[PDB]
Amino acid sequence: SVVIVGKISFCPKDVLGHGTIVYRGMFDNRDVAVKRILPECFSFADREVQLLRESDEHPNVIRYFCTERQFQYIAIELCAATLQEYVEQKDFAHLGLEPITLLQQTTSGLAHLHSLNIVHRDLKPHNILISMPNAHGKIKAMISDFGLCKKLAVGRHSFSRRSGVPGTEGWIAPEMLSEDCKENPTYTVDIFSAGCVFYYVISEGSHPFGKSLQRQANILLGACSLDCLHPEKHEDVIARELIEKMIAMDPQKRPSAKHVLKHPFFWSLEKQLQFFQDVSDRIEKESLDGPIVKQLERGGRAVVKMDWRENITVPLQTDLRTYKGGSVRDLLRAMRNKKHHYRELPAEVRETLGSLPDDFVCYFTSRFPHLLAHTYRAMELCSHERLFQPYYFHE
Amino acid sequence: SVVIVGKISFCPKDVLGHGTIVYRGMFDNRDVAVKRILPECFSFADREVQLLRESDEHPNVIRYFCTERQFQYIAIELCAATLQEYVEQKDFAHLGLEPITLLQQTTSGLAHLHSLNIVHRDLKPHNILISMPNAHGKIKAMISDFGLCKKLAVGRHSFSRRSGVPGTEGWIAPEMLSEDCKENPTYTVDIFSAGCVFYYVISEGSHPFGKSLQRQANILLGACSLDCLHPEKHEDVIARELIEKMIAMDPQKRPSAKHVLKHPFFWSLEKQLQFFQDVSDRIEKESLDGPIVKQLERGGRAVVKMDWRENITVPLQTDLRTYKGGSVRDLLRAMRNKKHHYRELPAEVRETLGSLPDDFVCYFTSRFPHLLAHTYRAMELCSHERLFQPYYFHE
Ligand SMILES: [Cl-]
Numbered sequence: 193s194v195v196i197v198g199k200i201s202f203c204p205k206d207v208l209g210h211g212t213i214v215y216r217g218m219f220d221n222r223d224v225a226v227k228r229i230l231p232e233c234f235s236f237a238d239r240e241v242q243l244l245r246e247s248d249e250h251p252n253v254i255r256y257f258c259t260e261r262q263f264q265y266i267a268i269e270l271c272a273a274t275l276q277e278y279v280e281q282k283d284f285a286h287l288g289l290e291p292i293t294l295l296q297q298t299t300s301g302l303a304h305l306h307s308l309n310i311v312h313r314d315l316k317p318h319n320i321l322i323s324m325p326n327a328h329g330k331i332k333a334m335i336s337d338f339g340l341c342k343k344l345a346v347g348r349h350s351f352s353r354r355s356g357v358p359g360t361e362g363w364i365a366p367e368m369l370s371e372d373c374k375e376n377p378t379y380t381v382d383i384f385s386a387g388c389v390f391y392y393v394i395s396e397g398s399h400p401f402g403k404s405l406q407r408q409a410n411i412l413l414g415a416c417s418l419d420c421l422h423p424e425k426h427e428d429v430i431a432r433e434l435i436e437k438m439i440a441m442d443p444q445k446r447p448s449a450k451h452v453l454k455h456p457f458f459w460s461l462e463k464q465l466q467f468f469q470d471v472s473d474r475i476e477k478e479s480l481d482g483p484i485v486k487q488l489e490r491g492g493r494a495v496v497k498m499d500w501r502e503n504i505t506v507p508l509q510t511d512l513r514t515y516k517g518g519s520v521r522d523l524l525r526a527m528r529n530k531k532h533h534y535r536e537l538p539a540e541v542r543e544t545l546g547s548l549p550d551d552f553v554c555y556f557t558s559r560f561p562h563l564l565a566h567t568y569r570a571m572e573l574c575s576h577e578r579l580f581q582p583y584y585f586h587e
Numbered sequence: 588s589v590v591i592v593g594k595i596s597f598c599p600k601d602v603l604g605h606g607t608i609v610y611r612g613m614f615d616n617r618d619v620a621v622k623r624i625l626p627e628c629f630s631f632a633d634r635e636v637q638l639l640r641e642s643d644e645h646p647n648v649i650r651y652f653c654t655e656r657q658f659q660y661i662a663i664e665l666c667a668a669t670l671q672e673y674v675e676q677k678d679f680a681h682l683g684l685e686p687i688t689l690l691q692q693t694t695s696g697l698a699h700l701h702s703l704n705i706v707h708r709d710l711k712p713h714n715i716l717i718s719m720p721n722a723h724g725k726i727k728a729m730i731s732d733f734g735l736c737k738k739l740a741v742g743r744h745s746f747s748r749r750s751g752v753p754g755t756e757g758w759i760a761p762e763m764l765s766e767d768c769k770e771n772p773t774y775t776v777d778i779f780s781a782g783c784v785f786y787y788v789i790s791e792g793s794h795p796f797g798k799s800l801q802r803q804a805n806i807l808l809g810a811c812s813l814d815c816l817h818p819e820k821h822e823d824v825i826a827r828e829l830i831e832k833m834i835a836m837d838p839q840k841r842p843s844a845k846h847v848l849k850h851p852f853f854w855s856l857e858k859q860l861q862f863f864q865d866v867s868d869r870i871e872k873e874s875l876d877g878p879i880v881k882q883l884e885r886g887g888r889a890v891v892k893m894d895w896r897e898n899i900t901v902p903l904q905t906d907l908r909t910y911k912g913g914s915v916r917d918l919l920r921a922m923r924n925k926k927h928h929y930r931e932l933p934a935e936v937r938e939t940l941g942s943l944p945d946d947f948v949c950y951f952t953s954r955f956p957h958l959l960a961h962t963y964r965a966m967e968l969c970s971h972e973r974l975f976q977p978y979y980f981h982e
């Protein structure tokens with residue numbers, strides 16, 4: 193019992209995970225998890241440890257404490273659970289927007305890794321760890337398991353799929369497996385995996401590519417469904433737009449981690465309302481026959497439901513100039529004015545609209561669940577402009 | 588290897604299930620599963636075997652072949668998988684209405700048991716077995732595990748909850764556990780469990796009372812959700828109406844197995860259209876101020892969407908007398924006439940309506956996903972009448 197190691201002591205009584213076994217222990221008065229690896233594993237351990245010294249500074253990469261006689265031991269930050277146990281054993285009704293936050297943090301950690309020229313290559317819910325609560329009861333997600341990590345030489349876009357063990361079935365990008373694919377895998381491999389993890393969290397446990405038995409088979413086939421994402425819920429429309437890109441079969445169509453972080457999927461209601469306002473300001477003096485406006489109005493009739501005037505509450509329809517009820521731009525101009533004159537807005541109107549800014553913006557997104565997604569895609573034409581830097585990653 | 592027993596031979600190489608272990612083997616030139624039980628289990632085995640001799644004749648009760656030296660052995664019908672493995676490891680996109688059929692068969696077997704005065708007391712997806720395909724590639728579900736079965740004396744409504752081990756957490760009716768409940772458990776205990784199994788299959792793996800960790804806790808609380816059942820899909824509305832009854836906290840409000848079998852949840856589209864027609868015929872000469880008609884029209888405005896004339900395709904709206912667009916009864920009268928004069932119906936109309944009878948009935952249920960459920964509830968006033976015996980269990 194209570195085996196003691198140089199600078200790390202752990203009792204085999206507490207077993208945490210299991211070919212290797214992990215135990216709860218202690219290092220230098222710190223509660224930490226401990227890793228023991230076989231001789232054949234002893235080589236993968238030196239790879240992992242190397243990279244943790246290199247990339248652990250980031251809050252969303254698991255902290256590495258030390259390695260210290262027949263086998264090899266690895267101490268790391270002690271966690272409350274994996275992302276898998278989190279999704280399986282927790283009522284989201286009580287957790288609020290915390291799941292989204294865990295996806296955001298996880299994305300931050302991946303973008304830290306990619307910026308270091310490190311492809312993870314094996315991201316999955318079992319790999320993502322949930323931290324013990326800090327002094328303020330806050331928790332975070334962290335990336336772990338760098339055994340299959342590869343570090344690309346500077347100026348290298350990809351890596352050989354052969355000579356490197358692929359992740360375990362279900363979360364592997366098609367470029368890793370298919371004999372047919374000529375192009376070599378790149379960083380987007382992790383975006384595909386992450387795309388699957390995004391869906392696994394939002395759906396509380398489903399997968400784009402079906403049940404665990406046929407996932408990898410479906411991945412190569414390109415047969416995926418996002419059944420859990422409703423086509424007329426604003427939150428679901430946004431999530432589908434991002435996840436569809438992340439899990440795309442063409443790796444070149446998948447967003448980079450830094451794109452993912454800029455995506456409306458992570459925007460507060462406040463920021464959503466700000467985007468709507470910056471767009472409306474941006475296009476206020478733009479010509480109707482112009483490119484920016486043309487693009488915003490294509491397929492817009494569907495977006496506003498043919499006549500958005502006929503789909504708002506009577507209090508606001510009464511308080512409404514030249515507004516054309518089929519124009520997305522006019523729907524935005526109205527919002528920009530109702531937001532600018534909210535105080536001067538009568539009480540029944542303000543009561544029906546709701547409080548600024550959260551209830552206000554949600555008054556419209558609830559009514560027009562494609563308006564934000566439509567607008568975000570259309571306004572990419574201005575991604576380069578300084579005004580829209582908070583909403584797009586340009587570089 | 589290949590241990591041989593008197594009339595049963597099995598090889599411990601093939602292990603099927605595991606405190607007891609089951610193996611694939613053979614009895615009298617028959618492929619069968621084999622059960623070995625501990626001495627403490629040796630008592631529960633005599634109970635189970637007794638009841639299988641008694642109730643195995645039913646196709647949806649697992650067939651029992653024989654029992655034949657230090658321990659006890661039990662041979663039974665060999666199955667392809669449990670209901671749990673079925674839901675977890677199978678793409679329903681290829682299986683069609685087979686899952687519903689498996690629920691129907693399972694219900695048939697339970698009603699066989701109840702008619703014998705046998706309460707199962709431990710129904711769960713792991714207990715329900717899927718048969719090997721027969722000569723025609725057809726399969727069936729079957730009840731097993733009678734270890735916790737109780738057989739009620741004649742004329743007995745209930746049984747003591749104490750002195751009998753409850754099922755394992757997650758599927759147990761609240762009457763089995765709560766110290767507060769005065770009324771003793773009855774057959775409806777199995778209906779609650781079945782209600783949970785119904786949802787577990789339709790949702791491809793969710794549970795009314797939340798994730799496995801808090802299910803039993805939520806069961807006692809009465810905190811259940813059927814999030815997977817859409818409020819405007821006809822199929823989902825029907826399923827919710829039945830499942831809500833089966834999992835009711837008040838055992839007296841749960842339907843008997845024979846009620847469940849009569850429920851529209853198991854009706855073919857053909858039979859649905861027949862019910863609509865029998866209802867329309869039944870109420871054709873019923874007074875508007877009458878009880879049957881009054882009941883059918885309460886909350887009916889919502890059911891037909893204020894004006895069903897405004898929610899049907901232009902081909903049929905053109906071909907439409909005195910029909911009042913807010914009356915459920917008039918919506919039914921129209922259907923009864925369009926079905927009676929389908930041949931004499933013009934081609935564009937018949938093209939928009941679809942083929943009799945499946946596409947026809949689905950033309951309306953798709954448009955009015957509460958019409959069948961509303962009508963089924965309202966017309967219970969005629970459950971006793973001979974005409975509606977195919978739709979209600981009266982006895
Ligand atoms: Cl780059």
Ligand SMILES: [Cl-]
Nearest residue numbers: 328329330331
């Ligand atoms: Cl918190």
Ligand SMILES: [Cl-]
Nearest residue numbers: 701702843982
């Ligand atoms: Cl009875």
Ligand SMILES: [Cl-]
Nearest residue numbers: 723724725726
């Ligand atoms: Cl078949």
Ligand SMILES: [Cs+]
Nearest residue numbers: 250251253255
């Ligand atoms: Cs860290």
Ligand SMILES: [Cs+]
Nearest residue numbers: 306307308309
């Ligand atoms: Cs890079």
Ligand SMILES: [Cs+]
Nearest residue numbers: 395396397398
């Ligand atoms: Cs799920």
Ligand SMILES: [Cs+]
Nearest residue numbers: 394425427428
């Ligand atoms: Cs949500």
Ligand SMILES: [Cs+]
Nearest residue numbers: 462463466582
């Ligand atoms: Cs800001």
Ligand SMILES: [Cs+]
Nearest residue numbers: 645646648650
């Ligand atoms: Cs049988």
Ligand SMILES: [Cs+]
Nearest residue numbers: 701702703704
């Ligand atoms: Cs009975």
Ligand SMILES: [Cs+]
Nearest residue numbers: 790791792793
């Ligand atoms: Cs599910």
Ligand SMILES: [Cs+]
Nearest residue numbers: 789820822823
């Ligand atoms: Cs369905």
Ligand SMILES: [Cs+]
Nearest residue numbers: 857858861977
């Ligand atoms: Cs019939």
Ligand code: NA
Nearest residue numbers: 572573575576
């Ligand atoms: Na641009």
Ligand code: NA
Nearest residue numbers: 967968970971
């Ligand atoms: Na009656």
